[PDB]
Each structure stands twice: as C-alpha cells, then as structure tokens.
Specification:
Non-ribosomal Peptide Synthetase Peptidyl Carrier Protein, Chain A; Retrovirus; Human Immunodeficiency Virus Type 1 Capsid Protein; Capsid protein p27, alternate cleaved 1 (chains A, B, C, D, E); viral protein; elongated; homopentamer; mainly alpha
C-alpha cells in the first residue's frame, strides 16, 4: 500500500473549499485522484479530509447505500469481478467497507486480502456517492435578468441553474430557450422576438444577442 | 490515449477565470495546452472545464461551423491529410466530432480509428473556434483621458480597445495616433501639438509625452 | 542526517497559519511530515518553526510529559525497542530529549548514537504532544441556528463543536441528533418532528431536512 | 528550436504585473529568462506577453534603436561575431529583427540561418531596450518624512527615488545624506545634528538613528 | 560557478516581504539558501534582491564589520582555513569582499581564486550580519492584555516581545512569568494567584490558565 500525497490532498481540499462540491473542475479533480483503485482506507480518509463533517456524514450514508446496491447485484450474479465461482468467495459488506476480519484499521492487510474487482467496485461506488452528496448539499423558474446585469452573466446563471436541476436531460434546451425569451428584460425580449432567422439552440440565441446587443 | 493533467487544466481554468478569455497570456496558455494533437474527447472535456456554460455553447457552435468549413475544403480536395485516396476514406463530420461508430464516449477507440491529419485539423478548428468565441463574449471612439488619470493608463486602455475591435490591421496605428491627438486632455493635446519633430508612430508619441510630461 | 526541506516546512507553517492547529488537513500534513523517524533536533526545530511561542512552550511541556510516560513504561519492560537487554542500554531522558553527551546541538552525533526504536518512540511522543496542545489551544450546548443561517452551516458548526469536545465517542451521535431536534429554529424543528420515518443518524436527518426544506 | 515554458512566462508576467517593470526582482527574473540566446521570435513573443500594449510599443522602438546602434558598430568593425570576413556575411537589420527572407513568422528557419553571435547581440539589445523602457514608463527633492511615518519607510522611499533618478552614480550618497539631514522631521534632524561621531554614509546614519530613536 | 535559482530567490523575497526579516521561518529559509558556500557575488546579489535599499545599506555595513573581525582573528592566527602557512597566502579584505584583482564583477574568476575556507568564512559573516540587521530594523514592559483580547494572543505577543529584546537569555522566563502575573487583566490575575500548585514555567502557567479560563 502506498498513500496518496498530502500535497495533492491539500490542493484538492482547497479546491473543494473555494470552488465548492459541484463545480466541473472539482469533479474533474476528484476523478483525477480517483484514477487508481483505492482501498476503503484511502477513500475514507480522503473524504474525511476534503469534506466537512455534515457532507461527510451524508457521504457515508450514500456510500453505504450504493455498496448495498452493488452487493444486491453481486448476489444476483455469481460472475461479479468481486465474487468468485464458489460460495466461499462471496463478498460481504464487511469486506467492502473494510470492516471484515484482518482489515479494521490496517491498510496493509486491507490491500492484502482485497480483490482488484473489489477495489474498482468500491471506487465506483464512492464516486457515485460523492456525486449524490454534491448534488444534495448546496430555482430556475425564478431567475430574472437584473436591470443592470449583462446578458452573458444572466445566461451563465440560467444555464447553471437549469442544468443543475431535476429536469430530464431532453428538456433543458427548450426550457433554456423559453426562459431566454420570457426573462431577459424587454429590450432583449424584443431583440429575440424580431429575429429574421429562427433560433433553435441556446448557443445561437446567445450569439445573436451578443452581436446585436445595445452597447452600453 | 493519455489524458491531460488535471493540475495543468486547473491552472488554465484559473487563468481563464482571472485574466479572461481574450488576454494574450490566456491565448498563449491555450496554445501551450493545444500543442500535441488532441482527440475530440480531450478538447471537448477541456472546453467543458475551462469555459462557463454559455461560452461553452457558443464554442460548440463555432467549432461545428469551422469543422463544416474544413469538411467542405476536404470534399473540394481529395488530398486532405484527413482524407484518403479512395472514396472509402472520406471523413464525415461524425468522425471529426467523435460521433462516428466505435467512438461515442470511448477515447481509446477514438485514438484507434482517428488519423493524425484528422487530429491536427480538429485541433486547429477548435483553436479558431476558441478565438472566435473569445472575441465575441466580452468602444474606442468613446475613450477619453480622465482628469486624474495618468497617460500610460490611458494609452493602455486606448490601444487595447483599438486592437481588440473590428478595424482592419492597417488602420490601427493612424487611429491610435489621431485619438492620442484629440483625446488626452488639452495639456497633453498642446504638448503633442507643439512637437518640434513629427511623430509618426504611437510608440514615439508615448515616449515624447513621457519625457516632457508635467510631473504632478 | 538529512534535513527536512524548508519548502515543505514553509508550506506546513502557512497551513498551520491559515487552517489552525486542529483542522484534519493540518493533522494529516503533520502526519505526512512525521513519516520518517525524526531526530530530536528535527522535531524540535520543526515545532519551533511551525508553532508560535506560547504553543511551543505548551508543546515542550506536553512532549516532556509523554516522554516521561514512555520512560516509565521502559523501566516497566526491559524489552523496549529503545532499551537493550543489559542494564547498560537503559535509555535516559537526556538521550530521548537530545540532552545526553555527544548530542547537545549536534544532529550528526545525534543520528549516530540514537536507536531506531528511540527515534520512533520520540516521534510518536511528539505526535501525541502535538495532538494534546492542538486540543488545548483554541461550547456545543450554546449553539443555535441563526434566523438567517442555512442548515448545512448550522450542522457543520454543531458537528464540529460536538466532536471537538470532551464527550465520550459513544455519546456524540445521540447528542448531535437531540441538538438537531431542539435547536434548529422551529420550522426545521417541526420538519424533523413530523417525519413519517424514524431518523436514527445525523446523516439521515441532514438528508431528510435537505430534501424537504423550504427553498428560500 | 525549443519554446520557452508558458508556465515560466505566466509566472514572469504575474511578477511584472504585481512588482512592476523596475523592481530588482523583476530585472533578475528577466535576466533569468534571458539566459540562453533567444531568437527574435522568442524575445518578440515574450515582450508581447509580459508587457502591456503601450510598453510594448515603447520596447519595439527602443529595441530598434539599440539594434541600429549595433549595426553601426558592426559596419564600423568587420570582426563582429555576427558578421563574417567577406562582405557577403554582413548582417542587415532584416536579419536581426527576423524580417529577412526565410525567417518571417518561421522560428525553425530563423534558428537555422541565424548565427550565435547574432543571437547574443539581439539578446543584449533586447535587454538594454527593456531597461530603457522600464526606466521610462513609471521626485527625490520633494520627499518629506510624514508626521506619523517611521524612519525606515522614509529611508526606503528616499533611497528608492534617489537611485531611480537621473543623478550620476557618484552623487547619490551625498544627496541621500543631505536629504536625511534636512528632511526627516526636526526630532530626527536634531538627533542627527547632535551626533558625537561624524556620519559619512547613509547606512551609518540609518544605524545611528535606529539605535537612538525615540521609541513611540 | 552556478547561480542560485531565481525561482527560489523570488520565493525568498516574497517570504521576506510578507513575514518580515525576523520571523523564525524567514531565518530558516535564509539558512536554507545559505547551505552551500556562496561567493561574494552570490551573497551580494541575494541581499540586493531580497532586502530593501535601507536594510541593504545596513547589511553592507554589518557585513564589512564582521569581515573585519574575521580578518583580525586571521592575523591573530596563521592557521585560518582562509589563510595559508606562508605570508603570501594572507587574505586581504579585498579578497573577501570580492574587490581583489581578477574578481571585480566576474563570478567565474571569483570562484577560481577563492578558497573553500574563504567561502565558508564569508558565508558565516554574511549570516551574522543578516541577523544583526534583522534585529536592528523593525517594548515588553508596556504590554497589557486588552479587555477583549484572548489569553493565547496576549501570551504570543508578550513572549515575542520578551524574546526579541535586549534581555539576557537567563532572564526571559522569570520576566515572562512576572508579566503574566501583573499584566493579564485582574480576572486572570486572580486565576493565577489562587493556583493550588506552584507554577514555575510560562508553559505551565499557560496550560493552567487555558484549563480554568472563563469560557466567554
């Protein structure tokens, strides 16, 4: 077992501290530090360091739930890369959470007894749990373009709130367009209304408005 | 396929966050991270991370348009480094945008089937699209030297606004000179007017004014 | 003897300066720089640099006390990895604190005469002393959720103050739950009260409240 | 040809942005990045990135003037390390500024045709031009010690303004001394006046005043 | 001769700029960059870059004085590692300050003619001069604990001012104790007075007060 660098962990913790849990740069950094299959000890200490107390509790809950789903799929298929062929290799949650015999508190023994399939399953479970908690911790129909706000800031805020919401993926573009048309105070409303071409994409609307906007 | 370092990507994202999209240092950094030919997956994720939502939409649009121009030039010349000699090697936009069969979401297969000419064409297209969006996202005839502003700040602001505008390249120096002469409040106006030598370059005017300026 | 990098020491000192003595990231960084067995000279200079004057005095006291406990255990067992089999290898506190003959002020001679068991015992003692001083230097029953404060901030503050207190480890979760129920101003109080399910964990309570909270 | 690292260039640009053009640390950093003989392309892009628009215009002017002086010295001596023995190796300004045939815009061809003497001459010329522009871009007889200002701040400000001025090098110390004596509000004036020893150096005056100053 | 990295020098200069000249971290960093024996050119340029103008003048003075003491000890002992056995190897101050023949302005020739004993003597002299100037550039009996100030801040400030003063080393602990007892506003005064145990060390007093302090 080789531990992760505390320098990388400190940089990731400061990234989470400044950018937040949900920024795409933060998720990219987590994916980076989630590259090699980690032992339960590694992921547990990593989340202990980078996350606050309450997000850490939420993450422990979510990780347990995802690992339980994994173990249900494992008992539903004896060909799991964590399982074996005989019944003596069936993987219990004590072995996944690092609670089994010969593993509690000892990362060396952990790395000894664990399977690579076990490691990758634990890692994917932890990543999904992190995503859930990030989506949970920190309203698009209440967003208006302020009287003094520029249009690119309004578009950024609106696209952020619409994509980070509970809508299906196939309903984001029409909603963003129809919110550009009805929000975005009446000067830009009339600018979009009197478009000789038909704008059928948020990017095209943004380009058109940026071209023909009233410089002020 | 080898991914780009998330450390470099984080540094580039913070550079774009503090300096903006159009600064020459930002374009130099992008050229740096645009050195090796990138796969559509790499450039797409890079622009997803460094750009906000609305600039990312604009960039997707511009990248598509530039790739379409490339494919028109490719059907206009069967000797494209992305094309082949026979008709079976003609490159479709699904293969350029990474949408073709065996490539959607898989960077390894992407790197397998793609040509080096394909990669360099995609990369140049993405760079040109980034330039377009940067020029589009964030008035030189309205610039005056404030009563309390120094002259080097006024010259910096004016040269910035004139070079980052829609003028032809051969019309920037005369405009900068004639704006130095008519803006730049009447003390410096008279200082430039009573120049025993003829100043025929913005640098020479700046040097002269910095020499003979009223220390205050 | 090889000294620790002043770059790492400067980074650790700034970490202690911004995050404090008790943050889990700071303790992780200290554990990182406490990886190889250090000589008394190294640990002494390290604590001189990273700690202020008063915490350094406290740490000297605590380190002495812990080393005295170690020496009592050593005279209680002749099989200490710092001791030897005969009486001529018994380790005095002058040899542990670096005060013995041939060691005062000289790290090379120190590294010469010291045992690896001596080094690891000194290191563990210094780590425990650092923990004591950190817990000592900088009230959970006085924590209320402010009228304008969000719930995740209140939960973070409360869990921090409860886990960094004098309670036994087996009494933190019930106290955190019962403080969520009685603090956390009456809207969230009624939200937790009318829970159709029984919430038996701080993480579950946090998840439930974050789901059903009044968006405002 | 190998390009300079954009990381070093970004760090140097931020150094120039925070410290300014004239700080000794900035000149040291420029000397550092001016260590290996650079091609006209390298120096031109470097100054384009680190300098603003108006300082870049000034620097282009100054670089041209210094290169013209170099070419005059070259036509005044056929043994220039840039020249050759016959008349066919005489170096024109198009070859120095990178404007000659086979060099315009191409750094590889540039590195091919250029001589090492050419490179070092271009580099020294660019360094001298940078020094000129830095001295030009951003009054010692108007400096007074404020009623609330400390003496080391006043001495720093005065020595800075005197050494960064148009005085000869052999006239700075007497001026600094006589400005310490006549500025530096009458308490320190009388403290310097009643000096039982004769102080004949700014450092000695500073030491004496720091010793006998009125602690307040 | 190999120059020191301008990156390390820039980091050290910023350390001196933020932390000051007298902080233990700054002295540790200087000791770090003072590890290999430096040539007079190196130390001179280093102090030119990291120190301001007035501290640099003070440091030149102090370095000269310390080198003169070294040369007096050298003429008092013909076995100096800088000296030789015959009279022709006697080391003059022109050779120490780098002013001798073949050394003025040339670091290569400097490194050629200088002895390793010369280098280490110059280096130790420069370090002692830096210590003197740092102690000189930027009152413990005037320190009171403010009505709103915490006790650890007061203890830090007091220990700093007492240890960075003109007292002998054997008089700091009693003074710190008696200042804890008479300063440190009457609540803590009575808390220390009514100590059932006798506190005979600043660390013990700090620990006792931190234990029994009035939480508020």
């Amino acid at each position: 077992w080789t531990p992760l660098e505390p320098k990388l962990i400190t940089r990731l913790a400061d990234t989470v501290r400044t950018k937040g849990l949900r920024s795409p740069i933060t998720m990219a950094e987590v994916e980076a530090l989630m590259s090699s299959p980690l032992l339960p000890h590694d992921v547990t200490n990593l989340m202990r360091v980078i996350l606050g107390p309450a997000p850490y509790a939420l993450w422990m809950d979510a990780w347990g739930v995802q690992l339980q789903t994994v173990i249900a799929a494992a008992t539903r298929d004896p060909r799991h890369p964590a399982n074996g062929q005989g019944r003596g290799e069936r993987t219990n949650l004590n072995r996944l959470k690092g609670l089994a015999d010969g593993m509690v508190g000892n990362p060396q023994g952990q790395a000894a007894l664990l399977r690579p399939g076990e490691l990758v399953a634990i890692t994917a479970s932890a990543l999904q749990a992190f995503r859930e908690v990030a989506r949970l911790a920190e309203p698009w129909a209440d967003i208006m373009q302020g009287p003094s706000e520029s249009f690119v800031d309004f578009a950024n805020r609106l696209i952020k709130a619409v994509e980070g919401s509970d809508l299906p993926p196939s309903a984001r573009a029409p909603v963003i367009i129809d919110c550009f048309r009805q929000k975005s105070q009446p000067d830009i409303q009339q600018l979009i209304r009197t478009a000789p071409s038909t704008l059928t994409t948020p990017g095209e609307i943004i380009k058109y408005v940026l071209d023909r906007q009233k410089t002020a």
